[PDB]
């Protein structure tokens, strides 16, 4: 969620200079979001493997 | 007097021709601003074009 990735809701850029830092903020947000989703995918594969073994 | 009036007309013409050269409200020939910065990199770094008032 917006708090989770550090975006901070109701956070915009009022001038043409805050956008120069918003670029980097969105880059970091995208990086950490993709990392979290990769971890979730790994966990799902683990669940599948253990289910097979339990069978 | 005729040559002076010709001179004055041509000067007024230069002024009109100079102040009308705006695209989208922004221009680099009137002298309104000191420089224009465009995007040049996917991270925000800019391409700088100084202003050349004419």
Characterize the structure shown:
The structure is cut from a larger assembly and holds 2 copies of chain A. Chain A has 55 residues and is mainly α. Helix content of chain A is 67%, strand content 0%. Chain A has 1 helix and no strands. The longest helix of chain A has 37 residues, at 18-54. Chains A and B meet through helix 1 of A and loops of B. Chain B: In C.crescentus, the flagellar filament is composed of multiple flagellins of 29 kDa; 27 kDa and 25 kDa. Chain B: Flagellin is the subunit protein which polymerizes to form the filaments of bacterial flagella. Chain B: Belongs to the bacterial flagellin family.
Topology readout:
This is part of a larger assembly, with two copies of chain A.
Chain A (H helix, E strand, L loop, with lengths): L17 H37 L1
Helix-strand category of chain A: mainly alpha
What value does the Rg of chain A take, in angstroms? 18 Å
Of all chain pairs, the largest interface belongs to: A-B, 5 and 2 residues
User: How much beta of chain A, percentage-wise?
Assistant: under 5%
> What series of H and E elements makes up the topology of chain A?
H
Helix content of chain A: 55-70%
GO molecular function (chain A): structural molecule activity
Family (chain A): Belongs to the bacterial flagellin family.
Subcellular location (chain A): Secreted; Bacterial flagellum
Main location (chain A): secreted
